[PDB]
Design a protein around this ligand. Structure first.
Ligand SMILES: Nc1ncnc2c1ncn2[C@@H]1O[C@@H]2/C=C/P(=O)(O)O[C@H]3[C@@H](F)[C@H](n4cnc5c(N)ncnc54)O[C@@H]3COP(=O)(O)O[C@H]2[C@H]1F
Lengths: 178, 178
C-alpha cells in the first residue's frame, strides 16, 4: 500500500501548506471573469497524468498563474508553490474559471510501476490509485486546513471504449459549486 | 514500510528532475569562492528536519540561491525548483561552499507519526529513516541521472548524550570530495 504514504505526504507537504493561503491568493488575482475559490484536483484512476492539461482536453485552456507562495522548508530558502488558473470551454463558450491541477503523486505511482527495483507491479496501478483517492478523501474531511477551499475530482475514462470529456467532468463539479 | 515509497517519490519527483540540470545551474552561478558541483543532501536519522539550516548549526550560513529551474508538471505551469547555496564556517573561517539541503520526506515521515489516522507509530521513525536512506542510496547508485552530482550525508546525533557539529559533518564529506 504505497499509495497510503503518498496521499499523506501529499497532504503534509503540499495541501496543508497551500490551502490556508489559497483563498487570499485567489482574491488578490481577481482584484489586481472571476476565479472560483476552490482548488480543483484531478484524480484520474488510470494514473494517466499529462504535464499539459490542454493536451488532455482542448477545452481546458491555461489562462494565468496565481500569485506565487513562498516558504522556507528543509534548508531551502523561499521554496516556491505556484498554481495555474484554467478556463473551461464548452461549445466555444467559456463556462468557468478555476485553479486546476492533477494530483502529482498519481504520476509518481505510474512512474514507480515502470522501475524494476521499485518492486511495484504495473497491475496494481488502479488499486493504488483508488487507495490514494480514498485516503486523500478521508484526510481532507478531517483536515482543518480544508474548509471549502478544495475539491477532489476522481474519474475512470472508458480507455478507448468510448469518448470522454475532461472539461465536462470538471464543469460538472464546478456547476454544483454554483 | 512507508519510507520505501517516499524514497522513490523523492527520486522520481525531484532528484531525477533536477540532477541532470544541476551542474549547469552551478556553473552559471560561479560565472555570473566557488560552489562545489554536488548537491549535498542531509539525512538525519532522528528525522529532525529544521526549516532553517542556520538554526541547526550557526556555522552553516546561507549565501545565495541558485538560478531557478522551471518545468511544467501535472497541469501546473512553470513549477519552480530552487536550491540554496550555503557557506560552511570553521573557527570563523569559510571552509566550503555548496548547495545544501535536508531531504524533505524525512520531515514528512516525522509529521506522519504525529497524525493518528496516518497509522504510523512514533517508535518507527528511526526504522523508516534508515529504510529511506538505504532505499535512496540504492536508487542513486543505479540512477543514470546521478553522475558525480549528488552526495548523501546520513548521521545520528547523540541526542543530548553529547555535542554534535553538523557543519563539521558536511565539511567531512566535502573535503573527501577534494
Ligand atoms: N520544488 C521542490 N523543492 C524541494 N523539494 C522538492 C521539490 N519538489 C519535489 N521535492 C522533493 O520530492 C518530493 C515530491 C514527491 P511527489 O510525487 O511529487 O508528490 C509531492 C507533490 F505532489 C506535492 N508538492 C509539493 N510541492 C509542490 C509544488 N510546489 N507544486 C505542486 N505540487 C507540490 O507534495 C508531494 C510530496 O511533497 P514533498 O515536498 O513532501 O516531497 C517532495 C520533496 F522531497
Amino acid at each position: 500500500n504505497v499509495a497510503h504514504g503518498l496521499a499523506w505526504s501529499y497532504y503534509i507537504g503540499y495541501l496543508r501548506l497551500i490551502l490556508p493561503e489559497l483563498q487570499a491568493r485567489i482574491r488578490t488575482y481577481n482584484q489586481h471573469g472571476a476565479v472560483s475559490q476552490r482548488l480543483y484536483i484531478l484524480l484520474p484512476l488510470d494514473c494517466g497524468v499529462p504535464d499539459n492539461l490542454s493536451m488532455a482536453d482542448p477545452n481546458i485552456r491555461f489562462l494565468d498563474k496565481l500569485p506565487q507562495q513562498t516558504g522556507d522548508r528543509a534548508g531551502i530558502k523561499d521554496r516556491v508553490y505556484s498554481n495555474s488558473i484554467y478556463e473551461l470551454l464548452e461549445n466555444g463558450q467559456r463556462a468557468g474559471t478555476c485553479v486546476l491541477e492533477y494530483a502529482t503523486p498519481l504520476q509518481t505511482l505510474f512512474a514507480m510501476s515502470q522501475y524494476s527495483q521499485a518492486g511495484f507491479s504495473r497491475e496494481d496501478r488502479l488499486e493504488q490509485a483508488k487507495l490514494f483517492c480514498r485516503t486523500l478523501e478521508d484526510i481532507l474531511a478531517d483536515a482543518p486546513e480544508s474548509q471549502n477551499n478544495c475539491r477532489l475530482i476522481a474519474y475512470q475514462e472508458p480507455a478507448d471504449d468510448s469518448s470522454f470529456s475532461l472539461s465536462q467532468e470538471v464543469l460538472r463539479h464546478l456547476r454544483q459549486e454554483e
